[model samples]
Target: KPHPWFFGKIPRAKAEEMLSKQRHDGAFLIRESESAPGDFSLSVKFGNDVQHFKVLRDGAGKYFLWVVKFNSLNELVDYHRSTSVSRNQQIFLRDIEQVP
Candidate 1:
């Protein structure tokens, strides 16, 4: 584990609420865990678009959540399936990456 700092244990319901209810007008929800080595899950809801995905730590002890920013909705996924990102629905375990 690199550092479990600033991450807290929250109930699954709370995570779900944060992921579901929060508007994506520049809002996000990230839940971290110490179950590792390590793990994390985050969600973003924007203008009728939402995505929830997992972040996994690499062997070197780090986590990476691959996020792409585009000018409009679904462009990243559209531009990138192999890239599983979609601007249509919530995700369970979509994009997974690791840190050095």
Candidate 2:
């Protein structure tokens, strides 16, 4: 997957630096199209947790998350089940729950 920047816009050195930073932060970087910035949401499932992030343009004209979930895997999993949105938000062998 490519970054949210144009090809050749970011120099090789800068790209490497950013990649290192992302690795250190343990974050999976995702890129959104400029024209369709307001047309997507990122849902990450870990363990039994499902994170619902709403990305939107803020007052500053910058894309930001209205709801951010960090290190709250447990909470997300509970919310998914409680709301009946998903039986198992996380992708774990033990956490898998079958629904009728």
Candidate 3:
């Protein structure tokens, strides 16, 4: 099954729209970086603001969650759920809740 946390090639405006509605701090989803096609963007909601973090890939094709490296995006997202990512903002990667 496809991961609900992964939104491929979604634009920044749309990502902001989705997270803004969530209204939950740390609510987040991973999308392809619009500026860099090969990279992913971590869009997380912090109160009324949405922050975008670029998830860059290493020379060996491994993705990085800032300082730490991951084998895949799924692992990167999974790992952050229990841990905070941002230095100033206590940003935890949380999935957006499902709606009926």
Candidate 4:
């Protein structure tokens, strides 16, 4: 199980706005878990090109997101279940790779 961390909340409108910007820019980084050591960075090139990147933090170092290209988006395009040690640690985003 994983510990919990409160990083504040992001409203649906803000999330939608971010997604919209990402869709247009072809890439965006989303913090999947406030307690996780990293965030998921998603990018799509022309012609359905999709990629998933992880930005892990080391010690007190600042967290940075990177883009990792995937052969297909299927692996991350669906909802994924995760277990955490603390109740406050909830799944921040499910089916994050799914567009719309």
Name the candidate that leads on TM-score: 3
State the C-alpha lDDT per candidate: 0.43, 0.33, 0.84, 0.32
- Residue-level lDDT tens digits of model 1 in 12-71: 455555545554332444555434334555554545555555654445544444554444
In model 3, state the lDDT of residue 53. 84
TM-score, model 3 to reference: 0.90
Tens-place lDDT per residue, model 2, 1-100, is 5232222333333433444433111122222334354343333334333333434554554443434232333343333332433233322212222122
- Measured with C-alpha atoms, the lDDT of residue 5 in candidate 2 is 22
Where does model 4 exceed 4 Å of error?
Answer: 1-25, 29-46, 66-100
Which candidate number has the best lDDT?
3
Number of the candidate with higher TM-score, 1 or 3: 3
Superior candidate under TM-score, 3 versus 4: 3
TM-score sort, best first: 3, 1, 4, 2
lDDT of 3 at 14: 96
Task: Give the CA lDDT, 0 to 100, for residue 7 in model 1.
Answer: 26
How displaced is residue 35 in candidate 1, in Å? 8.1
Error of 2 at 63 (Å): 1.1
